[PDB]
Each structure stands twice: as C-alpha cells, then as structure tokens.
Amino acid sequence: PSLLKKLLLAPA
Amino acid sequence: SGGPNVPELILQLLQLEPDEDQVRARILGSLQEPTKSRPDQPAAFGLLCRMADQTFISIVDWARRCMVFKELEVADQMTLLQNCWSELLVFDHIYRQVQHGKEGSILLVTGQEVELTTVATQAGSLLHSLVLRAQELVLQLLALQLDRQEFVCLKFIILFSLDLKFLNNHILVKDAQEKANAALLDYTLCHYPHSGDKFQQLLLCLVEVRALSMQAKEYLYHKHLGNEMPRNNLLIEMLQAKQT
Numbered sequence A: 001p002s003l004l005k006k007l008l009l010a011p012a
Numbered sequence B: 001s002g003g004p005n006v007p008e009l010i011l012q013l014l015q016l017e018p019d020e021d022q023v024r025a026r027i028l029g030s031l032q033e034p035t036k037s038r039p040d041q042p043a044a045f046g047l048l049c050r051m052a053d054q055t056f057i058s059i060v061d062w063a064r065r066c067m068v069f070k071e072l073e074v075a076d077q078m079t080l081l082q083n084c085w086s087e088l089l090v091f092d093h094i095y096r097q098v099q100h101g102k103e104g105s106i107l108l109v110t111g112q113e114v115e116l117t118t119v120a121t122q123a124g125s126l127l128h129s130l131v132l133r134a135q136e137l138v139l140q141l142l143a144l145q146l147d148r149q150e151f152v153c154l155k156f157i158i159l160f161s162l163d164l165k166f167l168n169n170h171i172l173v174k175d176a177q178e179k180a181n182a183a184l185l186d187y188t189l190c191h192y193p194h195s196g197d198k199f200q201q202l203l204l205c206l207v208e209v210r211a212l213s214m215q216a217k218e219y220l221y222h223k224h225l226g227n228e229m230p231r232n233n234l235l236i237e238m239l240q241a242k243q244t
C-alpha cells in the first residue's frame, strides 16, 4: 500500500 | 564543549548515528541507476527529488534503530514519521550546512556544492527564500555553537514532537519526550559556558525548523499540483498522508 509501511516492515 | 558527563540517551544516540560516507555512497549509487527521463524537465530536478527521497530512506533507517521507537508498533511509527518527515529532512540539511560551512554556498548530501548565486539566478522566489531562511537558521545554530550531541538529541526530540492523543502507546512516548528534554537541558546546563539559555534557544531553533518545514511542504505541494513530481515519489506520499 505505502512505501513507508514497506520500509518499516523491511528486514533489519 | 566535549563531554565528561553526557546523558546516556545522547551517547546511545551518538552510537546510533549512521556513517556519512556510507550514506553518501549509497545515495550516489541509488542516483546512478537508469531512469525514464522526462523531455520537458531538467534531469537534475528528478535526480534531486530522488536524492531527497533516499535521504529520507536513510533517515527512516535511522529511526528504525532508535530506542523507544523500535518498541512501538507500525501505526505509531507511521504517524510519527508522517508528522516529522519534513522537519527531519530540513534539520538534516541544516546540520549538514553547519558541519561543513561555506557561507557562499550550500552542501548537498551527495557532496556537491551549489553556490547561492546559482540559486539566486536559477531558482524561483519560493525556493530562494527557503534556502536563504535555512541559511539564516544555520548561522544562528553556528552562533550558538551547536555540537553533535545536541544535534542527535534534537533529532530525537523532533522524532517525538507530536501530541499524545494521536498515538496509541501514550505513556512510552511521553516518557521518551520527557527524557529527551531532560537530556537536552542537562547537557546544555553542563556544557555551555556562555550566557543565555541554550536549551530554550535550541527549542526556538526547532520552531523555526518546523515553520521552514511547512514552507518546504508548500513547495513540494506546488510542484505536485503542477504534475512536476516523478511518479511514486516517497516525499509526495508522505505529504499526501492524512495529517495529525
């Protein structure tokens, strides 16, 4: 949905 | 000064700060990638948009590693970031100007210098005013002898500068804010030998950063209404987020 959410849910 | 007795939060924040060279190289490499160049626009525009986007990527990456923030769920994080993105970017630019200060020009994250005359002759009145005001803020911060500790502390403060009613985890965020302010006040009281309340002055600086951020949002919005922004622009997505 949003790039921000993908970033925050991206692997660390 | 330097630091014999620095607040723990500030030290941990210093250890959480990313390396400038690595971020620079990453953003440069991200800009080197091929792109569908628009024939009715200077490519430099799109390159700078992507640059700001990547800068915000790095900023988000910095946020994800922060204390308290990493103990939060997705919703709160998204709310905070959507509330302070422009402020974080602007403050990043400003401190980049402070850390490497040539009064006749501005320094981008990529490493290239842009003289103020170029901005004065090629940019619009709005962006010109933005750069000039930002440079005034840089001058003020230089006058107050801003250091790295106060810098990361101020970034952390900005990250949680939001009314508690918009967040789900109230007490944690409140504790974060109070601890941040306490840390800043402690450091400023322990390290500033000059006169004036450096704490309060820095808070004023934060207010100015916020207004400047509002103006930046206005600029990006003007570009957006004219369909000048590239598709799937991260900053535009942040700007179109529901305001809290």
Ligand SMILES: CCCCCCCCCCCCCCCC(=O)OC[C@@H](COP(=O)(O)O[C@@H]1[C@H](O)[C@H](O)[C@@H](OP(=O)(O)O)[C@H](OP(=O)(O)O)[C@H]1O)OC(=O)CCCCCCCCCCCCCCC
Pocket (backbone or CB within 6 Å): B044, B045, B048, B049, B052, B085, B086, B087, B089, B090, B093, B114, B118, B119, B120, B122, B123, B124, B125, B127, B130, B131, B134, B212, B213, B216, B217, B219, B220, B226
């Ligand atoms: C949240 C903010 C984060 C920002 C953090 C990163 C800051 C990066 C600063 C980038 C500085 C690069 C400047 C390089 C030199 C430069 O001045 O090149 C031009 C300037 C832009 O010329 P123009 O479009 O303004 O000026 C136009 C232009 O003249 C058109 O051709 C006219 O159309 P026209 O021909 O029909 O008249 C427009 O008229 P109109 O009003 O009608 O639209 C006019 O306004 O450089 C750019 O391309 C920058 C691109 C922006 C990418 C990054 C987003 C920046 C948003 C916030 C500003 C950051 C400033 C820091 C202060 C807090």
